[PDB]
Design a protein around this ligand. Sequence first.
Ligand SMILES: N=C(N)CCCCNCCCNC(=O)CNC(=O)C[C@@H](O)[C@@H](N)CCC[C@@H](NC(=O)[C@H](CN)NC(=O)[C@@H](O)CNC(=O)C[C@H](N)c1ccc(O)cc1)C(=O)O
Ligand SMILES: [K+]
Ligand SMILES: [K+]
Ligand SMILES: [K+]
Ligand SMILES: [K+]
Ligand SMILES: [K+]
Ligand SMILES: [K+]
Ligand SMILES: [Mg+2]
Ligand SMILES: [Mg+2]
Ligand SMILES: [Mg+2]
Ligand SMILES: [Mg+2]
Ligand SMILES: [Mg+2]
Ligand SMILES: [Mg+2]
Ligand SMILES: [Mg+2]
Ligand SMILES: [Mg+2]
Ligand SMILES: [Mg+2]
Ligand SMILES: [Mg+2]
Ligand SMILES: [Mg+2]
Ligand SMILES: [Mg+2]
Ligand SMILES: [Mg+2]
Ligand SMILES: [Mg+2]
Lengths: 101, 116, 64, 102, 88, 65
Amino acid sequence: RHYEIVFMVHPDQSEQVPGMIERYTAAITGAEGKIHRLEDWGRRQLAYPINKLHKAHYVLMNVEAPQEVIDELETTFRFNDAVIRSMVMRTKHAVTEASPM
Amino acid sequence: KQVSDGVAHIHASFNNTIVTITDRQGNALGWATAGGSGFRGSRKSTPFAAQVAAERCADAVKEYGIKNLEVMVKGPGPGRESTIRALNAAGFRITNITDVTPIPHXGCRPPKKRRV
Amino acid sequence: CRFTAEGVQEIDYKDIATLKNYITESGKIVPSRITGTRAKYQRQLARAIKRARYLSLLPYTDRH
Amino acid sequence: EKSKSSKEQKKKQKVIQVKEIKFRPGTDEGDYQVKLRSLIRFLEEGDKAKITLRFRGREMAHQQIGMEVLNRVKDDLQELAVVESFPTKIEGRQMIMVLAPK
Amino acid sequence: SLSTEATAKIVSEFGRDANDTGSTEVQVALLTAQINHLQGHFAEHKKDHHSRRGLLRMVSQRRKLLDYLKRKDVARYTQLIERLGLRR
Amino acid sequence: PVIKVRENEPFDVALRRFKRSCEKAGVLAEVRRREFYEKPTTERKRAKASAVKRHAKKLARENAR
RNA sequence: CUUGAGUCUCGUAGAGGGGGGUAGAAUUCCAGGUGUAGCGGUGAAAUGCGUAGAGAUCUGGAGGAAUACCGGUGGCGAAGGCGGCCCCCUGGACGAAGACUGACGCUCAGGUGCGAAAGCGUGGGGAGCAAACAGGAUUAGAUACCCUGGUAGUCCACGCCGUAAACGAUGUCGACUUGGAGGUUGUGCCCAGGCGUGGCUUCCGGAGCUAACGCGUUAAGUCGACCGCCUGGGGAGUACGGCCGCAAGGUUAAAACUCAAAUGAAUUGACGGGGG
Ligand SMILES: N=C(N)CCCCNCCCNC(=O)CNC(=O)C[C@@H](O)[C@@H](N)CCC[C@@H](NC(=O)[C@H](CN)NC(=O)[C@@H](O)CNC(=O)C[C@H](N)c1ccc(O)cc1)C(=O)O
Ligand SMILES: [K+]
Ligand SMILES: [K+]
Ligand SMILES: [K+]
Ligand SMILES: [K+]
Ligand SMILES: [K+]
Ligand SMILES: [K+]
Ligand SMILES: [Mg+2]
Ligand SMILES: [Mg+2]
Ligand SMILES: [Mg+2]
Ligand SMILES: [Mg+2]
Ligand SMILES: [Mg+2]
Ligand SMILES: [Mg+2]
Ligand SMILES: [Mg+2]
Ligand SMILES: [Mg+2]
Ligand SMILES: [Mg+2]
Ligand SMILES: [Mg+2]
Ligand SMILES: [Mg+2]
Ligand SMILES: [Mg+2]
Ligand SMILES: [Mg+2]
Ligand SMILES: [Mg+2]
């Protein structure tokens, strides 16, 4: 299934991001999962205050992965209290071409 | 202590008008209603009764020495435009006028329609 | 309609420049009567804006 | 300051109001009994009752018929009320009795 | 619905050819698969009345096809009901 | 609606700008319609009424050659 | 046997259904800061709230319910109905080209299921709203309409109930019979534009039909198959009996008696606290 994950990180813990990117991409590729795109737009200004913050660290990942690993990736995002917000969508095809960030 | 820059909150209901002047942080200085300014009953819900309440509020904040104001109007009532014009005449420079009327995006069920 | 002319297959929640042409100053979705958007694309455009608002890429209201 | 408070404590006494009931010379038993229950209620709440009786056309010829209604009402509310202005003549095309509590 | 692969299997197992999608045995087989699959769905989701209506038309279409086969050729009928494990 | 007063602009023009901005947003029309509860059958009836009008105008316009 | 009915392949649109998560806005409440005499309500008032500091304004928290804008005689569903966003499970429809089965069909008394809101049972929950109820008014009276409050209920789980102007007041399936203007969703061809071809849907109108009003290829027209139902008004969808339900009640369903009408559409007046 072609998914598409976005997640935002607390701007203080902006240096845990390359670690987290590795930890997650590992679990995808460690169950016959591709990574058709990964981007890191970095810190940008929030359009409204999320729990008192005014900025956060954005990470896009397009993926092709088996059902259950995406469920496990969601349980991670929950309990990791550095992740302020996340969004797992489905897609029809794989997306490789670059976003406008 | 002198302030110079504050905020003018206008609560313009159908039945009354309240006008509070606050600082930058929303700490109050002095207030004036259109019910406390003589007018009673349905007299207090006129455009004129609001003008008076604005003018009476201007003179409660003489001792704080305010020059600049921002105007936070809230409601559908008659004393919307006239309250602002009154604060202009009282000598305050008006930096910014903002509507802050609450709308629920749905929310709670309102009361039944009046059969009259 | 733009999206017919350009041959857009899906409108993106990340193309914030394009989405900003279809919200108000207050930050409400503009009707298709006004813009001239075809009805299929109005439905996509609306989904996109609501996804953008969740990720705080667009505002819900102008008075946040 | 306030004293409004004290006014509210003074207000929880009473104000007497006058409740008007209107009979006619020919008024049937059931409809009489309804109007009596109105009067009982008013008097037990401590209010005055202006019982009227009207005449039309040639009902004025038989004034005695109307008088007995007012007498019947009076005797039914004897224990509850006192009479204050039992009528003498037809003033206009009306007679007016006024009762009062206890 | 049944997958493209799961379909293609049953067309081979029951068909007389693998273009033979039409035959009564294939049709009955395809329906039996999806009926059995949905027994799991309605175990959890007991108040999905709208989907259950789709199920009951599968059951109805199968019963009709079987009754056609019983009178067209009783030999092929008795084979099919044992393979698929149908009582009647 | 947020209207910053611009440099060397008089109060009257800024007050007019505030009105149009509120008109465009439709702030008061929202407050009016949310004052009392309108049950769904009523809202559907009103929707159908204005639809017939909108159509009837377009006809009578074009039906007048 | 392949033309009705099905199956397969590729795609398309959708508030179709079930489960779980989550977002922003708002109302109320709680706890603080600033501030001080009013607030609230009406046709007019009063009840109510506030110096034990309200209302207003600011910050932080708590909880429940519903998803502004998009939004549309737009869409989906057998009907009832279905509207934030995301995932999981799942039903139907439609189009293009073929391939396959070979009348496998249509309708349905009994039967079985689904079925708005209120209501019932057992547990939860409870912001807002609100039958009953309490107080304030209005009035000849006012067991109302208006005002301040307010319990069941409205929400959730599981079970029951089986009714609505549950309406298009129009049963299901199939064939045939001039046109015009739109919406929505596929698709072919030529060169965005042009020229075709399907599905669904809104408005006008021809023949014909109709008591008239109107209906008019989505028929109330022309025909064929099967089912349901009607036989003057009241008495009465009531009584009795049966079945069903915890109950409320539902369902099936008469007769005596009484009247010469009751009724539908349209016409001319008059009238309206309807409009110009
Ligand atoms: N012409 C009139 N007398 C008065 C005209 C109305 C009053 N004028 C406005 C006064 C100021 N405004 C208000 O006060 C706000 N309104 C209220 O609060 C009153 C309401 O309560 C309202 N419902 C009163 C009845 C109106 C109307 N009545 C009817 O239409 C109904 C039937 N629909 N009843 C009848 O017609 C008769 O059966 C009995 N009429 C009667 O005996 C009359 C009754 N006793 C009465 C009511 C109010 C009043 O001030 C004086 C007398 C009416 O014409 O009176
Ligand atoms: K989190
Ligand atoms: K309560
Ligand atoms: K005629
Ligand atoms: K019975
Ligand atoms: K008879
Ligand atoms: K007239
Ligand atoms: Mg449909
Ligand atoms: Mg599906
Ligand atoms: Mg209910
Ligand atoms: Mg209950
Ligand atoms: Mg209430
Ligand atoms: Mg009430
Ligand atoms: Mg019925
Ligand atoms: Mg309905
Ligand atoms: Mg209807
Ligand atoms: Mg009917
Ligand atoms: Mg049928
Ligand atoms: Mg027509
Ligand atoms: Mg007919
Ligand atoms: Mg009965």
